[PDB]
Symmetry: D2
Subunit: 328 residues, 4 copies
């Protein structure tokens, strides 16, 4: 516990200036209520939610009776479920989805950290309800949007945007984007959801967590970002939690593509399978940056108190009970 | 009033109360302020390249083609000069602007490149984040937008800042991705009222074309305020209501002369405003429905303080 | 004029190798008194509102009014007005034979009539008439009579042809093979436009596809303008900068304001005589 | 399968046969595959080859990453060192032309088919750039949809990295239009391709856009070692491909690609 807090403080002190600026901007956006988290499958994996490769394996066994000798490519993850949907029945696809996904899993500490960042919205490609459960637990209500009809009637101003659907209505393959056909016809089947996601990205500060740099959704969003006018948008932040430090060439390539990458493997040393360690390292760096645990010296408390107090210079007098809300 | 008209007014006023009402303002409201119409600009351009005014009437394509031909032939500088001499004018804000603002719209989307809506908002003391360029979407200072989807002349009286010629409309999706996306998202998440449009406008039909691609009953039908002199035909109303529009016809509500556009706009705007306090309760069962709608959530609670009941009924 | 001289020379050149394609519009059909579309819109408008337009039809109303009639009156009524208006036997104007006298490699037409088909049959030159999607694969010949808006050979029904606003909006989805074939013919051939105005919807539709092409990667199509007024210099250079080589018949010869037949004839025979 | 051979011979005699040739035929001629180009780009990027197998995106991303961070000159220099070689034409290049195809559509950027046609004396219009479409001087085409190095060993003349595949319709509107038109008006035989190839999947995505029965179902020549899994067969038969398998026809070694390619092609010629 207290050992970790000292290590995090030491990590921040030797942090790179680029990563320091990234953390500062993310924290400032969180303070402004403009922070949105784009949560991927890795956060759900941290809660032991079944990964899609298990489903592809099950479909491969049902197709031919034997698990594949080798490793699936990116197309196989989409093609094999499509082949099962076509050659086999719809009902078999939906039943396999039901038996693999109708499970109860707890919310990992990364969900709690993301919610503690105070996200204005949460966009996710996960079809689970872990983010919904965490939001319900922590007292913040999010309008969960996983279907076209949910966009028009959204209760609150803040959304939990499931861009690939979920299993609220039922554990059916027509409620989620899994097959190769679903990804091809995504823009035609999810106009309002895609439009809402793009608007949220354009109008907020985005942090990507739970994704690989070569993720399909990440590169689709980068392709869309390439269509925007230069300097007309804010570069989204990418939390990279891969076991090995990012290559310099890959880093500069993806930052020129429009990403501000915070690579976990470059900040702390962890085991190859210690994914929760890396996720917690980045998220806790952000949180204790917001909790002012990294203020180490004078002329930094001066800047903080000035940023809190300087707007009050316009007022003639401030009540003492008002000052309590000034410093939260 | 017709029953469907009263229903439309009910939904519009309810959305205004909930803060989910958005006004999509067209060139009619700016014309009510005697702002220079686009056909005058097309007239000047035609007099410029061709040397004489057009003998007949400008078609829908011509309004965009003639400025395009002028821009290609005479260049950008002459186009901007004519734009400046025609559009660098000071016009007042008509009462329709104030009437639109008095409904407390969440956002105001406009195809007008003038500052009349901005002037009205500044006069009423309503603060809107004015978005007329691509860089304004990310740098928006508030969550309530004055979305000028065709730009304006705030940066300057140039054709690059606005959508006027046919090349601007051809490349609009490529040139305004963020603004078009924001407009579509505001449409998908709010109650939309169209005012200042002619039901044959390019923007109206483009929005209906986008609407036809949406999932059935996944969106709320926008409201259209029609202020043409003649009443709408039954067939046209049926066609446009099946296209996803809830049309409120000013000519059907009131009687006015052909050129009394201001009175037609004001009839609908005042009837919308004066119905904010209205509850549309006439018969006895409408009384029970309203009180039940107010009280039924309180059935979850065992007891309610009588001093709290004044808040239930506002 | 100097510029016109090569315009004929290039067309006559491409005609010799069987590399010429004629893009036929409604003006050629109007020359044989084929029912124009405005009187169909007038019938649709009259049935819709019980009264003539008493005004001027915009470009959108030409497509919107049949769409309004189709939606609110049905398809059986829409096809019935098509049936009694287009089930007529009309002759072929001399321009039909003059287009065929140049021996074009292909004939692309937006017309839904059989006026070109009868002219092809009378001359004996066999064309593979393509207007439906299933017709693209089963084309016996490599010479195409491409009716990009369909026809009424299957029947005088609205889904066989592109008339309403929905048909034009959903054209690419409903006719990908026809649209693909038209663009390939345009890209690899010399194209001459007859029967079209500079403001025609289709003409500016290929012009919008032309600007998407790489510069100097295509032959600029030839436009034969038969509008009674002479072309304006500003209009001419604007469309020439858009990828058009306009051969204006009003400038070539002097004529009345109502006699279209010889304005088409002035350019059509002059191309023939140079061959 | 017997019906499939009948249709190909029928189309060959009528003059409506078009061969869609892939990298497998070029690889059969010992032409440098793309994976070893990605190897050089990856080695020159990260200082060492990657241990795992390259994914479909990686085949397109590392060349894109190399182009962005090392420049076009370095990208073209590696292209010259790998592709400025001379390779013999495999006998299948002859068997492809022995059927007298009306057109030949290639994703290959080599001149092996160009050399193959020139050896047999048949004149094909080689179109690999935008300008070549309008300047073609014959009805029959040798359509190189991904360009070639005829203009020069430059990355701008070919479709190699992921930007080229992303902007393909924008930079090759005439080439892709001609490719689609030829497919519509001819019977297509795919050779040198895998069922999971990007180009095959792209065409199958365009095929599903067409209405039912309006197109001729293309023929697919599969030369993979393992026989086609039955369930995989109906999936791609419904997608629009009539697949012929050399693995199912004859017993073959896993690495013996020539005889699998030749078994089906000689069957087509002997049926002529």
């Amino acid at each position: 516990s207290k050992r970790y807090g000292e290590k995090l403080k030491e990590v921040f002190l030797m942090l790179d200036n680029n990563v320091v600026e990234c953390i500062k901007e993310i924290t400032e956006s969180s303070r402004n209520g403009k922070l949105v988290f784009f949560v991927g499958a890795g956060v759900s994996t941290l809660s032991d939610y079944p990964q899609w490769w298990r489903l592809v394996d099950k479909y491969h066994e049902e197709l031919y009776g034997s698990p594949k000798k080798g490793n699936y490519s990116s197309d196989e993850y989409l093609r094999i479920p499509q082949i099962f949907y076509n050659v086999k029945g719809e009902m078999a696809f939906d039943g396999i989805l039901k038996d693999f996904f109708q499970v109860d899993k707890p919310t990992n500490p990364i969900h709690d950290k993301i919610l503690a960042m105070n996200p204005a919205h949460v966009i996710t490609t996960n079809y689970d309800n872990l983010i919904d459960t965490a939001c319900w637990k922590r007292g913040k209500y999010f309008s969960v949007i996983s279907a076209e009809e949910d966009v028009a009637n959204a209760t609150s101003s803040r959304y939990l945007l499931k861009v690939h659907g979920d299993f609220r209505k039922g554990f059916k393959g027509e409620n989620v984007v899994l097959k190769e056909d679903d990804y091809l016809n995504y823009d035609q089947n999810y106009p309002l959801i895609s439009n809402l996601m793009k608007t949220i990205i354009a109008t907020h500060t985005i942090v990507f967590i739970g994704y690989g740099l070569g993720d399909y959704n990440i590169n689709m969003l980068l392709n869309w970002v390439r269509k925007l006018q230069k300097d007309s948008f804010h570069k989204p932040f990418f939390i990279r939690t891969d076991p090995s430090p990012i290559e310099n060439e890959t880093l500069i390539y993806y930052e020129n593509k429009g990403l501000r990458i915070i690579d976990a493997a470059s900040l702390i040393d962890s085991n190859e399978y210690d994914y929760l360690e890396r996720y917690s390292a980045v998220m806790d760096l952000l949180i204790e940056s917001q909790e002012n645990k990294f203020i180490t010296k004078d002329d930094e408390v001066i800047d903080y108190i000035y940023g809190k107090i300087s707007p009050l210079f316009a007022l003639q007098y401030i009540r003492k009970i008002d000052l309590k809300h000034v410093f939260e």
